[PDB]
Amino acid sequence: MQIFVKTLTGKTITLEVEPSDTIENVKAKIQDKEGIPPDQQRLIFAGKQLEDGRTLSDYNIQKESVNHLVLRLRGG
């Protein structure tokens, strides 16, 4: 399935993912596209912070056809 990520500029990228994919797996894909180390990423879905050992299915990524995660840059 495809998801969007809103990036630090408010633009979107698309990732090809499966519901069982971990948040750590998603953050690695975001690192490859946006150059943010995973330990400096905070990923949000519907205002909820996503935890690295959990999966997209844990956050019900399947409920909607179109989903946008939000990338935030941890503060220094």
Residue numbers in the entry: 1 to 76
From the paper:
The Ser/Thr protein kinase PINK1 phosphorylates the well‐folded, globular protein ubiquitin (Ub) at a relatively protected site, Ser65. We previously showed that Ser65 phosphorylation results in a conformational change in which Ub adopts a dynamic equilibrium between the known, common Ub conformation and a distinct, second conformation wherein the last β‐strand is retracted to extend the Ser65 loop and shorten the C‐terminal tail. We show using chemical exchange saturation transfer (CEST) nuclear magnetic resonance experiments that a similar, C‐terminally retracted (Ub‐CR) conformation also exists at low population in wild‐type Ub.
To overcome this and to generate exclusively Ser65‐phosphorylated Ub in the Ub‐CR conformation, Leu67 was mutated to Asn, and Thr66 was mutated to Val (termed hereafter Ub TVLN mutant). Ub TVLN was phosphorylated only once, on Ser65, showed a clean, single‐species bTROSY spectrum highly similar to Ub L67S in the unphosphorylated form, and when phosphorylated was highly similar to the phosphoUb‐CR conformation (Wauer et al, 2015a). Together, this showed that Ub TVLN is an excellent mimic for the Ub‐CR conformer. Hydrogen bonding patterns observed in the crystal structures matched the experimentally determined hydrogen bonding pattern for the phosphoUb‐CR conformation (Wauer et al, 2015a), and the phosphoUb TVLN structure is similar to a recently reported NMR structure of phosphoUb‐CR. Likewise, in phosphoUb TVLN, the Ser65‐containing loop is extended and seemingly mobile, with the phosphate group exposed making no contacts to the Ub core. For Ub TVLN, we observe ~99% occupancy in the Ub‐CR conformation at 45°C, with an exchange rate of 120 s−1. PhPINK1 interaction leads to almost complete protection of the entire Ser65 loop of Ub TVLN showing that in the Ub‐CR conformation the phosphorylation site is part of the interface with PINK1. Hence, phosphorylation of the Ub‐CR mutant Ub TVLN is ~45–140‐fold faster as compared to variants where this conformation is much less populated (wt Ub) or disfavoured (Ub L71Y).
